[PDB]
Amino acid sequence: MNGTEGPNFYVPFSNKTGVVRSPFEAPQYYLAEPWQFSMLAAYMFLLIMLGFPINFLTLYVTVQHKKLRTPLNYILLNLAVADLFMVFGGFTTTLYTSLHGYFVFGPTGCNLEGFFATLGGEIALWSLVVLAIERYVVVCKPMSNFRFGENHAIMGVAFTWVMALACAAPPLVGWSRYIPEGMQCSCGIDYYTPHEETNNESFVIYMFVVHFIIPLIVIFFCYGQLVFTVKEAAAQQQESATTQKAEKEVTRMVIIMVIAFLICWLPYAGVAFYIFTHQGSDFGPIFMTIPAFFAKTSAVYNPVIYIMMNKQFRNCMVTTLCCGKNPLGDDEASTTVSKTETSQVAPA
Amino acid sequence: MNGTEGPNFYVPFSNKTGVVRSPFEAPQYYLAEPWQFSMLAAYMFLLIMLGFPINFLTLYVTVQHKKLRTPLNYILLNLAVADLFMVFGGFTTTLYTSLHGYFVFGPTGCNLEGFFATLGGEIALWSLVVLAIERYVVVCKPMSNFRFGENHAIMGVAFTWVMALACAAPPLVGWSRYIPEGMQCSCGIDYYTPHEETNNESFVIYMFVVHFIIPLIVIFFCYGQLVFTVKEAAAQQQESATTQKAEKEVTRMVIIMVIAFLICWLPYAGVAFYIFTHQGSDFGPIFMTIPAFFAKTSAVYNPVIYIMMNKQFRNCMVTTLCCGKNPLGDDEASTTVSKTETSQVAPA
Numbered sequence A, B: 001m002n003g004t005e006g007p008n009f010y011v012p013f014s015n016k017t018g019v020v021r022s023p024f025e026a027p028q029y030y031l032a033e034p035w036q037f038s039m040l041a042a043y044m045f046l047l048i049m050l051g052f053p054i055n056f057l058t059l060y061v062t063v064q065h066k067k068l069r070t071p072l073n074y075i076l077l078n079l080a081v082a083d084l085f086m087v088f089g090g091f092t093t094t095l096y097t098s099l100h101g102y103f104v105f106g107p108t109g110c111n112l113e114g115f116f117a118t119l120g121g122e123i124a125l126w127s128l129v130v131l132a133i134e135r136y137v138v139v140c141k142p143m144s145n146f147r148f149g150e151n152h153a154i155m156g157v158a159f160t161w162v163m164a165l166a167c168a169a170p171p172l173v174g175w176s177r178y179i180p181e182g183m184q185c186s187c188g189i190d191y192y193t194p195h196e197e198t199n200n201e202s203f204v205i206y207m208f209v210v211h212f213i214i215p216l217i218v219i220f221f222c223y224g225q226l227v228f229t230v231k232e233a234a235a236q237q238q239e240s241a242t243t244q245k246a247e248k249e250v251t252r253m254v255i256i257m258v259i260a261f262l263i264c265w266l267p268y269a270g271v272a273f274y275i276f277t278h279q280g281s282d283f284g285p286i287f288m289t290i291p292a293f294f295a296k297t298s299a300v301y302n303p304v305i306y307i308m309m310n311k312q313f314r315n316c317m318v319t320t321l322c323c324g325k326n327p328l329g330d331d332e333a334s335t336t337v338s339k340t341e342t343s344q345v346a347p348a
């Protein structure tokens, strides 16, 4: 056999030399050099050191500024929370696991590890579909007098947690399951064994269709809509109204956010599908370790794209950070927002 | 003319089309795509969000743990402090600048950007010499009963600041000057023009001989000394006394720190020197942007070598992160201490 299937695992290493051992009971240094695990450990550490501040700061700014209440300001507040669950929820276990060369906390740690990374990526994926819509409803404007209230935003946010949970929670209760992958310091869904006892083969198809092919289609198709309408071609102050102009920005961003997602997940999803379609074949520990760990940057790139592609949030952040105010920068030239300064309601 | 010189700059772009404008008065988007500036801006944001907690935490642990006071401990607090300046003193302007496409704070921002990036890198090169020495004084011990006390440590620290300032400061008071480079989002020493009005050519030979070629000779030399004595080969607990084997671990860190530094500056120093001996030739903005923005990682790679290459520091840091105690792991094995917990001195 090319690997070593266990009742709880599947190490991508032959046990012909009987050197293989349950990744819930002993270091896996026979899969790779111990320094490479240190790498993972070092890496997971820097990610937690970056992901905590960036996602907490994002969260703190959003809340403190009473006007940052657009559908977009919601979705990204959502992403910051889900990213903080990633950091504290599973990243803590993945660094702890890399530090020991195996899942000391056994399957429980593997579930934390798997669940939160899943929950996080999936909340990002579904938040993209909500943006695709909101983006569409404003650009191709289907109604003749409609506008997304905060309520809607809270609806979209509630929707992403039902969809993400619909995909992330099943494996904890008998449908499919989380299993260690690559150097066995991370955990994902089961694409490795057909384990009929927990119905793995069906869940994997349920996840690649309901939580992937489909949301991607929506998102992609919706883009093909905002092709003839709002284009990437974004000029200066006013495009047909400084309003419309600044509309071209959110969409440009919502489009970058999509490219960042794919880059981050296509490789993982790709190897994952392969393995599903080539179970038991001869792949090694490094095969899935690279995309599996690279994809964890998903807990941080969102806020970065946000602060670099949103003059208003960046300013609100600079204002926040600068303790007092003085948003120096160039401001947004347009609306502003905060707590006691110029959060002065200015509708109609 | 291949580039466009101003009395204040030098844009590595021809003004044949008349599209060039002061990197002090308007965006340089005609030098490169606007997304590429957003790219540089994302890079710096991360550098600021990682370099801050990592150099601050370093600083805080050292000060907090009463035993971390060896020369090494002294040099790296320094670095942690020189790194916090780069980040706040300069990286902040380099982010804001990329966020706008040019130096909005004119030459003052340029000075901020360049001075600190210079102050920071030079302190690093000088501290590398102080280590080369302390290293040779312990491995080739030219003395009889001489010990490198904390006093010799505060000396070698002050010394690095005298050298670093000797280079970082002149350009601010009339000898040479800081000028934007590459996409004009970073500032450096004037390798571009002769501007006799400020003696550029001289300062540049001063900096490549005193603050580069010399220290590297020393460091490389002392490395030759400890070639026959302590080398890379370091066995388990002891090699002629665990004291003699625990030092061979500080030496390898010092070597790695030197490698890390070279990988960070030779490319820059090289481009920088290439341009000084070929001023006016045909190079573009990308030419110096890469090695220039790549070197800014100097504000964070040091603390990482240290955590990864110094058990003592490592274990004593996690003790700080576990709020209270909870040494877990396998303690420092040798000394351990902190602010009060295991701070108990057990010397002679």
Ligand SMILES: *[C@@H]1O[C@H](CO)[C@@H](O[C@@H]2O[C@H](CO)[C@@H](O[C@@H]3O[C@H](CO)[C@@H](O)[C@H](O[C@@H]4O[C@H](CO)[C@@H](O)[C@H](O)[C@@H]4O)[C@@H]3O)[C@H](O)[C@H]2NC(C)=O)[C@H](O)[C@H]1NC(C)=O
Residues within 6 Å of the ligand: B004, B006, B015, B017, B018, B019, B020, B021, B022
């Ligand atoms: C590359 O070649 C270009 C074409 O030959 C050449 O173009 C000249 O560019 C200058 C500025 O870069 C132009 O002069 C400006 O004209 C505007 C009027 O529209 C003025 O407002 C501006 O000065 C102002 O001064 C105020 C007081 O200090 C200040 O508040 C303002 O902000 C602003 O500084 C300039 O007088 C000039 O018209 C252009 N001539 C041509 C032929 O178009 C570029 O300068 C040249 N670029 C290089 C060499 O870097």
Ligand SMILES: *[C@@H]1O[C@H](CO)[C@@H](O[C@@H]2O[C@H](CO)[C@@H](O[C@H]3O[C@H](CO)[C@@H](O)[C@H](O)[C@@H]3O)[C@H](O)[C@H]2NC(C)=O)[C@H](O)[C@H]1NC(C)=O
Residues within 6 Å of the ligand: A004, A005, A006, A015, A017, A018, A019, A020, A021, A022
């Ligand atoms: C790869 O082949 C190895 C040899 O067949 C095999 O080693 C076996 O590992 C098990 C661990 O479960 C040992 O079983 C021990 O189980 C408990 C330990 O708490 C106790 O009842 C006994 O100590 C018992 O020995 C086997 O003894 C051991 N057999 C050997 C060394 O020949 C690996 O498990 C195989 N890799 C896999 C499938 O994980």
Ligand SMILES: *[C@@H]1O[C@H](CO)[C@@H](O[C@@H]2O[C@H](CO)[C@@H](O)[C@H](O)[C@H]2NC(C)=O)[C@H](O)[C@H]1NC(C)=O
Residues within 6 Å of the ligand: A001, A002, A280, A281, A282, A283
């Ligand atoms: C072990 O792995 C090898 C290589 O991945 C498998 O061999 C392949 O077998 C399939 C048929 O299932 C062929 O289409 C390929 O051409 C084979 N490739 C090679 C390298 O021979 C093998 O099937 C695996 N063994 C099992 C079933 O555990």
Ligand SMILES: *[C@@H]1O[C@H](CO)[C@@H](O[C@@H]2O[C@H](CO)[C@@H](O)[C@H](O)[C@H]2NC(C)=O)[C@H](O)[C@H]1NC(C)=O
Residues within 6 Å of the ligand: B001, B002, B003, B280, B281, B282
């Ligand atoms: C503009 O840039 C070109 C490219 O470097 C310069 O041309 C070089 O000139 C040197 C000395 O005159 C020759 O040895 C090289 O062979 C030339 N490079 C080539 C092959 O083009 C040119 O001198 C520069 N012009 C200015 C403003 O000085």
Ligand SMILES: *C/C=C(C)/C=C/C=C(C)/C=C/C1=C(C)CCCC1(C)C
Residues within 6 Å of the ligand: A113, A114, A117, A118, A120, A121, A122, A125, A186, A187, A188, A189, A207, A208, A211, A212, A265, A268, A269, A272, A291, A292, A293, A295, A296
């Ligand atoms: C380190 C953590 C890892 C590798 C997380 C595992 C996450 C999953 C099994 C998630 C699956 C998918 C997505 C989040 C995005 C779309 C594609 C999937 C179905 C492969």
Ligand SMILES: *C/C=C(C)/C=C/C=C(C)/C=C/C1=C(C)CCCC1(C)C
Residues within 6 Å of the ligand: B113, B114, B117, B118, B121, B122, B125, B186, B187, B188, B189, B207, B208, B211, B212, B265, B268, B269, B270, B272, B292, B293, B295, B296
């Ligand atoms: C982004 C910041 C930059 C490009 C910093 C500029 C720094 C200098 C002018 C520093 C010069 C040098 C060193 C610190 C190391 C040795 C080689 C030099 C002389 C090129």
Ligand SMILES: CCCCCCCS[C@@H]1O[C@H](CO)[C@@H](O)[C@H](O)[C@H]1O
Residues within 6 Å of the ligand: A266, A267, A268, A270, A271, A274, A282, A283, A284, A287
């Ligand atoms: C960006 C999507 C990534 C898609 C994943 C590609 C799986 S590709 C697969 O990898 C195996 C490694 O053991 C090779 O042995 C095999 O020949 C190759 O076809």
Ligand SMILES: CCCCCCCS[C@@H]1O[C@H](CO)[C@@H](O)[C@H](O)[C@H]1O
Residues within 6 Å of the ligand: A249, A256, A304, A305, A306, A308, A309, A310, B034, B035, B036, B038, B039, B042
């Ligand atoms: C961290 C992700 C940000 C870097 C990726 C570049 C995306 S794109 C970039 O965005 C700028 C800000 O709105 C625009 O002004 C510019 O025209 C556009 O090309």
Ligand SMILES: CCCCCCCS[C@@H]1O[C@H](CO)[C@@H](O)[C@H](O)[C@H]1O
Residues within 6 Å of the ligand: B266, B267, B268, B270, B271, B274, B282, B283, B284, B287
């Ligand atoms: C260690 C990195 C040192 C890099 C120094 C080599 C510079 S190389 C130099 O670059 C010019 C501008 O791009 C070209 O026009 C020229 O043909 C090329 O030889």
Ligand SMILES: CCCCCCCS[C@@H]1O[C@H](CO)[C@@H](O)[C@H](O)[C@H]1O
Residues within 6 Å of the ligand: A045, A099, A100, B311, B314, B315, B318, B321, B328, B329, B330, B331
């Ligand atoms: C929480 C901060 C993360 C920094 C990682 C510190 C790894 S520390 C490492 O751990 C091993 C087993 O646990 C011990 O045997 C060893 O002595 C200790 O130095």
Ligand SMILES: [Hg+2]
Residues within 6 Å of the ligand: A131, A132, A133, A135, A136, A219, A222, A223, A226
């Ligand atoms: Hg869309």
Ligand SMILES: [Hg+2]
Residues within 6 Å of the ligand: A260, A263, A264, A294, A295, A297, A298, A301
């Ligand atoms: Hg990513």
Ligand SMILES: [Hg+2]
Residues within 6 Å of the ligand: A312, A313, A315, A316, A317, A332, A335, A336, A337, A338
């Ligand atoms: Hg604002």
Ligand SMILES: [Hg+2]
Residues within 6 Å of the ligand: B131, B132, B133, B135, B136, B219, B222, B223, B224, B226
């Ligand atoms: Hg040395």
Ligand SMILES: [Hg+2]
Residues within 6 Å of the ligand: B260, B261, B263, B264, B297, B298, B301
């Ligand atoms: Hg470096």
Ligand SMILES: [Hg+2]
Residues within 6 Å of the ligand: B065, B315, B316, B317, B319, B336, B337, B338
């Ligand atoms: Hg300690």
